[PDB]
Amino acid sequence: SGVGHSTGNYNNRTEFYYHGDEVTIVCHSSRHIHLNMSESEEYKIYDTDRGPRFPTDQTLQGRDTINDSYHAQVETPWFLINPNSWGTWMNPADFQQLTTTCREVTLEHLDQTLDNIVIKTVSKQGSGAEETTQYNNDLTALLQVALDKSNQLPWVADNMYLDSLGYIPWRPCKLKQYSYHVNFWNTIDIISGPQQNQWQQVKKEIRWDDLQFTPIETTTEIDLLRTGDSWTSGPYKFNTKPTQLSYHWQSTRHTGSVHPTDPPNAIGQQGQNIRDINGWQWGDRSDPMSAATRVSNFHIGYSWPEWRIHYGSGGPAINPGAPFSQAPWSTDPQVRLTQGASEKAIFDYNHGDDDPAHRDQWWQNNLPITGQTNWAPKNAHQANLSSNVPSRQEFWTQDYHNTFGPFTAVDDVGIQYPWGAIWTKTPDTTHKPMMSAHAPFICKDGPPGQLLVKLAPNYTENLQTDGLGNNRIVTYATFWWTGKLILKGKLRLPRQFNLYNLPGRPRGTEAKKFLPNEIGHFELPFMPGRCMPNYTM
Amino acid sequence: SGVGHSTGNYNNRTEFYYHGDEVTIVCHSSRHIHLNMSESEEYKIYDTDRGPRFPTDQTLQGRDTINDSYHAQVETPWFLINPNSWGTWMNPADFQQLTTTCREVTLEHLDQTLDNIVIKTVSKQGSGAEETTQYNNDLTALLQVALDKSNQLPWVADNMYLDSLGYIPWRPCKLKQYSYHVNFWNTIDIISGPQQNQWQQVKKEIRWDDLQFTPIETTTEIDLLRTGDSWTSGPYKFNTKPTQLSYHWQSTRHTGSVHPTDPPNAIGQQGQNIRDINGWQWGDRSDPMSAATRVSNFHIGYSWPEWRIHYGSGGPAINPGAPFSQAPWSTDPQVRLTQGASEKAIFDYNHGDDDPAHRDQWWQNNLPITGQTNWAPKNAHQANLSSNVPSRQEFWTQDYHNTFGPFTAVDDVGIQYPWGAIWTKTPDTTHKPMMSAHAPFICKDGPPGQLLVKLAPNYTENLQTDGLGNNRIVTYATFWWTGKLILKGKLRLPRQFNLYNLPGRPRGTEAKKFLPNEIGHFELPFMPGRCMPNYTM
Amino acid sequence: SGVGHSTGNYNNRTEFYYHGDEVTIVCHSSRHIHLNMSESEEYKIYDTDRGPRFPTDQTLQGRDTINDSYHAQVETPWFLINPNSWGTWMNPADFQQLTTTCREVTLEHLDQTLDNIVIKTVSKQGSGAEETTQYNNDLTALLQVALDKSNQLPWVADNMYLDSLGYIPWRPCKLKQYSYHVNFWNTIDIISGPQQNQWQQVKKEIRWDDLQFTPIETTTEIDLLRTGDSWTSGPYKFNTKPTQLSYHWQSTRHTGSVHPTDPPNAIGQQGQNIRDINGWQWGDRSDPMSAATRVSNFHIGYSWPEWRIHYGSGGPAINPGAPFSQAPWSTDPQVRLTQGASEKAIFDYNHGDDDPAHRDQWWQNNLPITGQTNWAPKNAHQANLSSNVPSRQEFWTQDYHNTFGPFTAVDDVGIQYPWGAIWTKTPDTTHKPMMSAHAPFICKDGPPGQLLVKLAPNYTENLQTDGLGNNRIVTYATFWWTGKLILKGKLRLPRQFNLYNLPGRPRGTEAKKFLPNEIGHFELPFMPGRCMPNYTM
Numbered sequence A, B, C: 001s002g003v004g005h006s007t008g009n010y011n012n013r014t015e016f017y018y019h020g021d022e023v024t025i026v027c028h029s030s031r032h033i034h035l036n037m038s039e040s041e042e043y044k045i046y047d048t049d050r051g052p053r054f055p056t057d058q059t060l061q062g063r064d065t066i067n068d069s070y071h072a073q074v075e076t077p078w079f080l081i082n083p084n085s086w087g088t089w090m091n092p093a094d095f096q097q098l099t100t101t102c103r104e105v106t107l108e109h110l111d112q113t114l115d116n117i118v119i120k121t122v123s124k125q126g127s128g129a130e131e132t133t134q135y136n137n138d139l140t141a142l143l144q145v146a147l148d149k150s151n152q153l154p155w156v157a158d159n160m161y162l163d164s165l166g167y168i169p170w171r172p173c174k175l176k177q178y179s180y181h182v183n184f185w186n187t188i189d190i191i192s193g194p195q196q197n198q199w200q201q202v203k204k205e206i207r208w209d210d211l212q213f214t215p216i217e218t219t220t221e222i223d224l225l226r227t228g229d230s231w232t233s234g235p236y237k238f239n240t241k242p243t244q245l246s247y248h249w250q251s252t253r254h255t256g257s258v259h260p261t262d263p264p265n266a267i268g269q270q271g272q273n274i275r276d277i278n279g280w281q282w283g284d285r286s287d288p289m290s291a292a293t294r295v296s297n298f299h300i301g302y303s304w305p306e307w308r309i310h311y312g313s314g315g316p317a318i319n320p321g322a323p324f325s326q327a328p329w330s331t332d333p334q335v336r337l338t339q340g341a342s343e344k345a346i347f348d349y350n351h352g353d354d355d356p357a358h359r360d361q362w363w364q365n366n367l368p369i370t371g372q373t374n375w376a377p378k379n380a381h382q383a384n385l386s387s388n389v390p391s392r393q394e395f396w397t398q399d400y401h402n403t404f405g406p407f408t409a410v411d412d413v414g415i416q417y418p419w420g421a422i423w424t425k426t427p428d429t430t431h432k433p434m435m436s437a438h439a440p441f442i443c444k445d446g447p448p449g450q451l452l453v454k455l456a457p458n459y460t461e462n463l464q465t466d467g468l469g470n471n472r473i474v475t476y477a478t479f480w481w482t483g484k485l486i487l488k489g490k491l492r493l494p495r496q497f498n499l500y501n502l503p504g505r506p507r508g509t510e511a512k513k514f515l516p517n518e519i520g521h522f523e524l525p526f527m528p529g530r531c532m533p534n535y536t537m
Helices: A092-101 B092-101 C092-101
Strands: A014-019 A022-036 A044-046 A073-081 A102-125 A132-137 A144-147 A176-181 A184-189 A200-206 A246-248 A343-347 A360-364 A380-382 A451-454 A475-491 A532-534 B014-019 B022-036 B044-046 B073-081 B102-125 B132-137 B144-147 B176-181 B184-189 B200-206 B246-248 B343-347 B360-364 B451-454 B475-491 B532-534 C014-019 C022-036 C044-046 C073-081 C102-125 C132-137 C144-147 C176-181 C184-189 C200-206 C246-248 C343-347 C360-364 C451-454 C475-491 C532-534
Touching: A014 A092, A014 C014, A022 A092, A022 A102, A092 A102, A092 A475, B014 B092, B022 B092, B022 B102, B092 B102, B092 B475, B102 C132, C014 C092, C022 C092, C022 C102, C092 C102, C092 C475
Parallel strands: A246 A532, B246 B532, C246 C532
Antiparallel strands: A014 A022, A022 A475, A044 A073, A073 A176, A073 A451, A102 A132, A102 A475, A144 A451, A184 A200, A343 A360, B014 B022, B022 B475, B044 B073, B073 B176, B073 B451, B102 B132, B102 B475, B144 B451, B184 B200, B343 B360, C014 C022, C022 C475, C044 C073, C073 C176, C073 C451, C102 C132, C102 C475, C144 C451, C184 C200, C343 C360
């Protein structure tokens, strides 16, 4: 109510409601957010240095140009609260209850609030030796809150770089400055020079004639909040398609009808293949009837020119490729095969690292999902397919061709528990993208708004235009973000006779981790998301 | 009704109902099915031998690895009745009435029954010299019938390998054992070894830690049927999109507005092209105005790295490619060009071969459909397109690039009368496949159930756990499968002035075939399905 | 309906219905039962030989007398169908869905039927060399079915010796003869003779003056069933108490409030115990304040004189003891410590062995359940408990005393998936037993009836009083037992933050087992039943 009455109740809890075949998950989440002043209220547009490791000479002949940090950003004074992640919502054990008991999951509703604003000012008083800091509550101070529900501001809320509320409910969350890119041209030609051994810079610049520059003030309607105030975004209903929580093991060989076979006899025999069968084939091929050249309706998985560096305007990037596993081709573990569109997640203490002052690294190799595996080197093509064997010519080996076509079916990476986006917004273009390399859900109209908070500046008695921070009072606010999202799901009913054998968390892990140390340091486990097997076709 | 009263009437007949512009085909079908005992009631999981012709040495350096029969299956005691084919429904002359008088065909309703169960036991009695077999009807015997309408069991009902009810109504149909694949890894690396001349086996195995093994018993609700019983599946309504019964001859050159031209004069002149015309072009190209570089909205047909061997997990496979004709590039008939995604159909006596004890082979070369023809060798690309001719560089010839893109339009293979699937099920994945290399119809939700029949085991007085078949009585049942499917179609109204000239069945055929011999042996004709020409754009 | 119309549908399937916090499991089960004739229609009362390994001399001085097979039974012509087991109802994967998603399980309803009776006669005809057997259905034959719902006949339906319907739905089940014990005295005195080194037989006999002998005919109302008949027992509602599916790890040291402690500092320190604390103790003990002598309300687990041989009337037996784990005391795995009231299950091919002609053995060591562990040797007692240390006297070590008392709390063995009784009946006595060493559920009024089937005798034309089997016709019947039981349960909601780590099936197991061999031989896995941890107090 007033100054002395609190507003919301901290509720961090999930509720599974089963009715019939439709489960309904309600994920409450609440975090204590530490919002600290600002670097400067002025909006700034500036480029950056090229970056680390970027070559200054020609030796590796531009193979190091894959390292480019050059970018041009506009850094605003505002701050960003994005509850886009798993683990901002569900704790590990309530994700496991969901992953086993649900087949397809669907977002429906979302809610956000802010409450229990607490604004304080530090006061430096002392000889410089002692120099006590003294904290004084501000009952007159303000907290500007802007929810861009009109989907006007640049979205830039995706979870890449892992700027999100922490994954551990009892720790304070320091927010992250808001900023977005401005149009810039970074073009590197690695093919230049004699014998194409010389990389050469082309155009590096911010292109000024076109800059679309929007401040947060003019774009939306800001809500000023004194300590005794609370802010509730509102109901937001998602419109999406359900995902799948079960991985697929069927390639195109595991797919159709089965090659006719006579059974074995005793426990030592493999049985035999009927030498003469009837069925469709591909070429003039007849005599060696086989399951390899069997015609199938669809093909599953596609070749890709793997790790393709884009070198577009603005800099080099990577086109994702296809998310498949190297397990069939593993052979010796000594080599690390990265080509499955694997992802490494470099994360921080608040994000589920254990030891502070260092970065724990977790490499996702996608071991469950096979049968979608097409390794571009290993493929091949023939000129003539028939009962005759091709010559040394007519047979090609190293390809790296895009084999994506109208017949192919593919899988997304699914949901990844500790780190991953929940939703995403689609670029508005002709031909919206079909699927996404990371986020499981794709918003059809808008993304669910975006929440920007800035701590209204407190200025000293002297206000000088030349002054920046020497002119404002040091302050920090701490408020409580309480969100709620509602999931719907279909219930998963056991389809098999034998028990479910799982890796049961990554098998290369120790259970002494994941549990609080003597200090309280512990790592969150990486749940595969897409987990139990299923029949593709 | 009871023991002595029959149930259903054999009805094998099609009914064309014309009302307005909407034709309705009702295809009744009925078959006499001979269901013979079983190999063993136990569910068995076993791999197979590699296969025939698979090389045991390194000579052809792995070019023979395209022959791989290795697979791992689980063979169940059940049997499969799949009425998925054309020719299980319509006879040749009622397909021709449909193909001429209908434009687009659509599945709507489907029905299946079983009736007039007859169960018998053989009895061996004699000196071994005479050894009479004597048949005794079983009024107490059972016939387990399971319709997996819940789309739980693996589907594996596609018509590849041509396991389907026979195409000739008056002959008995022997059923086919039901089985499906289990997860296995067959990985062949043909690029291994020094100078990449050595193929090397990698991993061949059944991967046991993950097997999804479902018996038919626990998965569904089985219906026990004594002789006086009949079983009716139920109404099943398809949800699909109409196909097209007319082939397209228009490439991208036949498509748009026509290059302005002055007419000829007499019967000996070809007319001339206006040298100076106005219109769009592509590059800086101006002076040689031509219909080649005319801009067009869409492109029709796409290049493919033709006969691409996948070598995925589980074994080598083939990615289909595009269904086009070699007729433009035919030149001499002496060479057989297989690259049009052609298909050979190896079929059997009951499936429309004439002479038993041998396999008749029918190679579908897709002669009608051209203009979609893109032969990957023949293409090329240039660096700069302009009024200047490129040099020896800047022009490339042999490509084998996938040219499928956002602008391309393509065609399916359509329906193929004697042999082809009717429907199919889509793999449940992100990005469902667009079209299918074989089956014309693609089910959106489920496929129309699947019908499994097993003959309930009759055990001898002594039941020993060590015994298998020595412990059960020889038996065979014969029942009558009567299906009905309802098609809707749009009526085809003649759009042209001149007569329709058709090849009128393949022109390389004799009409003395296709008609019963002195013995009664005759071959079913291959109707192209997609037949009459039409305007693409 | 009649002769040619079947009756029931084979349904072997489980249905999970979730509504609110109350899950409802409905387990259908159906089996094909092979009922083979009988040994003799006469009721026989006879003793047995003593048994194997029972000593005939005095060497081991009676330590082998623990092996006594002597018993006196009355073997009736009837046969017993007992669906008392887990695995007659649920398959492994639907037990795992239940065990994870349910907290406490409760029996409610039960149902049984018989249908599709098929009666046949073998006919021996030949020279003795060939000697064909020929099978002829009997439409006039009968099948006597007696359901003793009046709880009159001896119950003797418990699952010990594992006489139950098979655990694999697709295999035929051979029934088991019905018989029960008659009063007999087998008394062995192992303490007899000089220096108590001589075991001496006392009284071995059937005590005739008291025999309570009840035939099945006079006791109940039998229902004669011809082939066209079906029999439905009826609704039976259980009255019981829910069990617990979660094991308890808390001993009496893990139970109460926690000894006050100052925290450690860095990751290398264990922290310290406050030397001076306030709280209750036991004796005059004060100065060494410790958590050992802390007073607690209850004690958990009790000592027992473990493996106590009873040597009552009728023979030696074993009083069960307490079901605890040896894991804390394990030390080297080389020794097998059996004293936890462990159980070995010797089972058969149809009961989940893989290889026939041999017995697979599975030893249940109860690894999950600790904290209830009291190993009678390791305990001790003191005369005076105080700040003074006792002398060599006043301290005793080897006890083997029953420590069960009014303060102790204990756990049952819970449910054991492949092999275990579901229900049991309580002996009707003053002071009904509290808990049971094996079966999880204990019926308050009756057990759910008992189903006895006998195949009505077919006699040859000559009926002689001297004749037994030479006077009746060889016959066997095969019918379909279809049961249904309904379970209610409370839903299990995750109470912890961290993931659930399970042994994930016994960790000493291979997954290549449990799946059908090339022959179809596979073993059912042993699910612990009581599985996830929980807080005792």
